[PDB]
Every structure is written in C-alpha cells, then in structure tokens.
Design a protein around this nucleic acid. Sequence first.
RNA 1: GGGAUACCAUGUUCAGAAGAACGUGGUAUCUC
Length: 90
Amino acid sequence: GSLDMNAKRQLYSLIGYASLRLHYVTVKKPTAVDPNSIVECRVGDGTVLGTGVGRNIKIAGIRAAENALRDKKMLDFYAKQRAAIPRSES
RNA sequence: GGGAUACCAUGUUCAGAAGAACGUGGUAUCUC
C-alpha cells in the first residue's frame, strides 16, 4: 500500500461522514537535530484511530491516515454507526 | 557540495472510485 491517495480516501470516503469531527493532531514539535515528528489520528469524540511518526514528518502525516484505515474493526465499527446514527451523535 | 524542520505569504497537485494532502519562494537553526 503505502499510498496517501488510498488513505485520505479511506478517511473521507470510507468513514468520514457528515458531523464526524475526524481530525489529526500534530505532536512532537520537530527539531533541527531530529526533525522526526509524530501524528495522532483521532476524532472529536476522543477516539484515536491510530498514529504515525517519521523523520520528514510527512511519513507521519500519510502514516497517520493509513493508520486510520488500519483498523478493519474500527472502520466497520463506524460503518454500522453510520447506519444507526440518528441525525446526531447518539 | 548534499539534506531537513519550521515561520511569513500564496497556489498547485495527488488521484482518476473517492475525496484529501502537499507544494512554491523569502528568512533561519541545525545537520551531513
């Protein structure tokens, strides 16, 4: 895999629905002696789908995405939620 | 000689299912 296109898609194409809040948070302020940074993949609900770290951070970005789609159970979990979700959170 | 993160500003591209991310250059610290 290792394909962003695929990732980003899996996100706002396989799960990312209306009123999801899905969002990534950058953590580990890069350094000029180890730029490497990490990414947190979670949702406003306080749920982290996964994570991703890299030396040129990007790997971290794309890695984070692939991480979100790296949870078949989590993914499918939202699939059902999507069907349920009564025009709101609960 | 090469290489990288980031601030300030703006835009393109990735893909080609779907929709998102990265880049362009100005300055700088560090590093090989």
